[PDB]
Amino acid sequence: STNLKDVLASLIPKEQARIKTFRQQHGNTAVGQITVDMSYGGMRGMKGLIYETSVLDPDEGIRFRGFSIPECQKLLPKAGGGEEPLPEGLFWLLVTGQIPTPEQVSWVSKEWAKRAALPSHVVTMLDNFPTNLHPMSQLSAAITALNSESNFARAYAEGINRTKYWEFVYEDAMDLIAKLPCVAAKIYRNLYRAGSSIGAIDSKLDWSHNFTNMLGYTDPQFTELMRLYLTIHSDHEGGNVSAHTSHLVGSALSDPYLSFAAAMNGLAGPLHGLANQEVLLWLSQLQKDLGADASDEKLRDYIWNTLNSGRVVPGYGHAVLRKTDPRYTCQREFALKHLPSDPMFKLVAQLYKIVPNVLLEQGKAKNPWPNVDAHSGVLLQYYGMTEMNYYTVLFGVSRALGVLAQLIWSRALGFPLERPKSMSTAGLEKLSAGG
Amino acid sequence: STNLKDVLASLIPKEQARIKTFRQQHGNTAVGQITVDMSYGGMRGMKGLIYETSVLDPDEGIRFRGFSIPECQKLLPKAGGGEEPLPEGLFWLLVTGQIPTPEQVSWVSKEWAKRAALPSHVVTMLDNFPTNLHPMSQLSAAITALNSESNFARAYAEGINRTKYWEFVYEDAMDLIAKLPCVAAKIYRNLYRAGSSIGAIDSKLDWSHNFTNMLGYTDPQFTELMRLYLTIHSDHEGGNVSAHTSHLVGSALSDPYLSFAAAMNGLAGPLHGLANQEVLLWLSQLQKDLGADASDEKLRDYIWNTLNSGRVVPGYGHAVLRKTDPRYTCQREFALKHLPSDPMFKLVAQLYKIVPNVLLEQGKAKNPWPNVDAHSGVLLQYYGMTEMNYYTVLFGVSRALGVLAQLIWSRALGFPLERPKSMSTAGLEKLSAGG
Ligand SMILES: CC(C)(COP(=O)(O)OP(=O)(O)OC[C@H]1O[C@@H](n2cnc3c(N)ncnc32)[C@H](O)[C@@H]1OP(=O)(O)O)[C@@H](O)C(=O)NCCC(=O)NCCCC(=O)NO
Ligand SMILES: CC(C)(COP(=O)(O)OP(=O)(O)OC[C@H]1O[C@@H](n2cnc3c(N)ncnc32)[C@H](O)[C@@H]1OP(=O)(O)O)[C@@H](O)C(=O)NCCC(=O)NCCCC(=O)NO
Ligand SMILES: O=C([O-])CC(=O)C(=O)O
Ligand SMILES: O=C([O-])CC(=O)C(=O)O
């Protein structure tokens, strides 16, 4: 009775019409200007893409189809006896724009359970990878290697009319989200629990729960952390590196597997999702240098040394946000409720009182406040997931939700190839006069 | 005596200063406006990035550091007894902006020969891949898997000061360009010449020549075709999908291996580099449907059927070009000189007289003229390289030259994270009033 595909079939034509008319009336309306500094500055401040699933406000933070994090916490269906929102429900919301029922949520969970399966070539590849090959690299290679199963790639090769692209994107998206946790978990076990198996999917559990089981964790609170983690990391508008990458790549009609893998290559950057890992490594050196309970003056010192060495302080700053990331706050609230006395948590809390001030003092960062990455690893470590080089994988798994939801829409709406004009410094100087 | 690294060490600081001053004077100067239609239209017509290596003119085609194709043909050093420009020389030009000497060119060739080597994990992976896994997917997975050797990734993890990034990018770039042909050729042999070996690199030959040897081709004209192919496919300004992808991904400080692999995922799109493959498959069905020597009326018919079925005609049209791609012309001239009587060539020639007109008649395409992809496979087929699903790999190998040359510069110049602002249809409607 529940079928997302049928819901979308109704939704698509209305949005098409709506955008059509809008463009009819405002296509030539200017929404902004481009300056030399924006071009040199990684398009900072440039309104450049249409991305429907979520929109980030510089002061208020992210909204998912118009809802804030607290709103989601409050509205989305939870697990039986749970407190944290099920990522399945978030997916529904991103895709349809509507809050799902628990019934709808359970369908998503079954669907994902049904579609979870890995081809042998992929298993073989993962099992043959060296342990010194970073987890994100293993993840991206595996997803790329899965493209042999692409239903979209297959339909395209058959000559499908462009109007049906969305339908095949939808299938691969659902298939890929379903397989993610199996891939991710196989990496975890191969690297850190050599000789054991991820086991099988329980068609009766939610996606997060099957995932934690494959990871080998039994604590129920951990399952709850996972559900939250996976929900809040899902999407962050379209201009962030990973999302933009999926967008750009999909625009050329590469299948979702290839688009998602390219995205992961972007998430793996130190200035992007790798920060979650970098924060923990930074904290480890800290505690190692100074030792467990540091004084504020010592913390300051340590921060300055980093800045003075031509490095960034991981987990702080943002290209768009101008205040503390609500994702950070949300994590803080979780810690406060569950592991208030953890020394690492306490360290993280202490830095919140210090880092921003030093950054302010330094005068370079536009946003001296923390971002999501400053608070995620600390939670993970508490539950026994101490493998910091693996943290980004979790982020990657989450992010699939947002980017794949948009991807369906991009093709439904007929968005064309992303192809802006570039310029050379010399050409630009000429364009103006030069300086 | 020749050392590109030392040359760049001198060049870098001057460019820095120059850009510094320019921005001082013109940073706030507006170079353009953004309209609703540009945002909905994949940034078409938006001046959005700085990319130094090459600049595309909509009428005149591509210029590499200010030189046109014919100019390069004429200025770049050739092989002994050769006619086509050595890609090594093109690389030098992109990187330094100066035409290299033959001596300089030979150094590049030695350097690339010296650095060529594959780690076992990568060889193992390639050898275990299934034959139904597309060549581009095999290629991207392999490059990603090579990141275990990244010198940049390693330095970053060591805390290197940001000012030295370029130095490590340069090393990985040279290493990666050197390994490309080994990877690419191993794929070719595994898929199409099962049981044979690529053999070893001859430190005495140019890069193209070692590549053709590993591919197993003996014809000297083929070596010449390769040199040309690899040179002309090298770069095409910064806003094309593959380049933009490398740019975006590298901007987050992902290493060159990861940035290049993501790019390949974009090149593999049917609207991008996969077109070279698609053109040949389209021609094969053509010849199959109609049979070898078709009438113009039949060709028209066949074209219309494609268009009427909601598909594109591969190899025609362009996001920026508005006239026939000089890369196409350059290939035509090659064919005319070497395989003037080939029936497929002749077919390709015939379509040039017909396709544009049909496209014009249809009234949708902005540019009814052919692009590079319409003429490349035909040349390859003539020499016995009939594996059309492999053609994009060649493109990928070439493209490494341009994107990696820019990548060094992006980090030298300190370009920040690419992170534009996105918008939702609803948010945008509000911003204006809505339509
Ligand atoms: C998130 C970043 C990349 C935003 O970049 P951008 O929009 O260019 O920041 P900005 O405009 O404030 O930069 C202005 C200057 O302050 C510096 N600065 C910014 N944040 C800084 C930080 N955390 N530490 C040190 N210096 C910093 C910038 O590097 C830049 O210096 P230069 O002018 O000398 O280049 C930046 O804040 C940063 O590097 N932060 C640390 C890395 C991090 O935490 N990344 C994860 C972010 C969230 C995410 O994507 N999660 O997945
Ligand atoms: C190269 C492309 C993607 C440029 O896209 P874009 O800048 O959006 O083209 P455009 O503005 O002319 O598009 C206007 C309309 O004409 C259509 N059109 C454009 N080229 C077309 C073609 N070759 N066949 C059929 N329809 C075409 C577009 O799809 C679009 O239709 P809708 O409005 O219904 O969406 C386009 O010309 C195309 O699809 N060409 C065929 C594929 C191809 O040859 N790709 C390789 C290009 C070069 C390259 O990257 N090599 O690596
Ligand atoms: O929004 C950004 O640019 C980066 C970020 O926090 C995310 O992708 O989660
Ligand atoms: O310029 C473009 O957009 C596509 C193209 O021809 C290339 O990348 O070679």
Curated annotation (Swiss-Prot), chains A, B:
Pathway: Carbohydrate metabolism; tricarboxylic acid cycle; isocitrate from oxaloacetate: step 1/2
EC numbers: 2.3.3.1
An individual GO BP term: tricarboxylic acid cycle
Primary enzyme class: transferase
Subcellular location: Mitochondrion matrix
GO cellular component, one term: mitochondrion
Binding site for oxaloacetate: 327, 399, 419
Keyword tags: Mitochondrion, Transferase, Tricarboxylic acid cycle
Catalysed reaction, written as an equation: oxaloacetate + acetyl-CoA + H2O = citrate + CoA + H(+)
Active site: 272, 318, 373
Record flagged with keyword Calcium: no
GO molecular function: citrate (Si)-synthase activity; citrate synthase activity; identical protein binding
Major subcellular location class: mitochondrion
Similarity comment text for this entry: Belongs to the citrate synthase family.
Assembly notes: Homodimer.
Function: Key enzyme of the Krebs tricarboxylic acid cycle which catalyzes the synthesis of citrate from acetyl coenzyme A and oxaloacetate.
Note: Citrate synthase is found in nearly all cells capable of oxidative metabolism.
Protein name per its UniProtKB record: Citrate synthase, mitochondrial
Name of the coding gene: CS
